[PDB]
Amino acid sequence: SAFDRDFGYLMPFLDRVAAAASDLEDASARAELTRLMVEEKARWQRIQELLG
Amino acid sequence: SAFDRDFGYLMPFLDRVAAAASDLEDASARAELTRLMVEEKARWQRIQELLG
Numbered sequence: 001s002a003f004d005r006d007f008g009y010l011m012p013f014l015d016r017v018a019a020a021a022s023d024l025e026d027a028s029a030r031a032e033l034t035r036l037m038v039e040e041k042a043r044w045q046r047i048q049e050l051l052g
Numbered sequence: 053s054a055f056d057r058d059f060g061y062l063m064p065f066l067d068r069v070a071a072a073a074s075d076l077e078d079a080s081a082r083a084e085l086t087r088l089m090v091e092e093k094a095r096w097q098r099i100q101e102l103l104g
């Protein structure tokens with residue numbers, strides 16, 4: 001509840017960061033950020049399970 | 053970076069979720085969220101490096 005506003009910003013933000021992952025010219029940076037955003041989605045699902 | 057304003061809000065948000073971990077009632081959820089927020093902090097500092 002107290003975090004519904006913050007998740008309201010957070011979820012499009014994760015979408016934008018995973019979308020910006022494709023735009024990195026560097027291949028290592030693109031691979032790391034793409035894997036990190038995949039991990040971040042599962043993490044944030046678990047985090048809001050814990051908060052809820 | 054079109055994420056500069058985002059991170060200015062993202063890191064205080066991570067702090068608030070770390071503080072809210074302490075007020076969870078199941079102790080295992082408290083431990084799990086605390087550890088999660090620590091990692092979230094380190095990981096988003098990295099992601100902010102990859103976006104620059």
Ligand SMILES: Cc1cc2nc3c(=O)[nH]c(=O)nc-3n(C[C@H](O)[C@H](O)[C@H](O)COP(=O)(O)O)c2cc1C
Nearest residue numbers: 005006007008009010013057058059061062064065
């Ligand atoms: C990634 C992210 C970006 C945010 N960006 C903004 C923003 O640009 N403007 C804003 O007012 N709140 C933003 N927020 C929400 C703030 O963290 C916070 O909920 C808001 O300032 C309301 O504060 P209050 O609870 O004291 O009213 C963002 C949250 C996150 C997680």
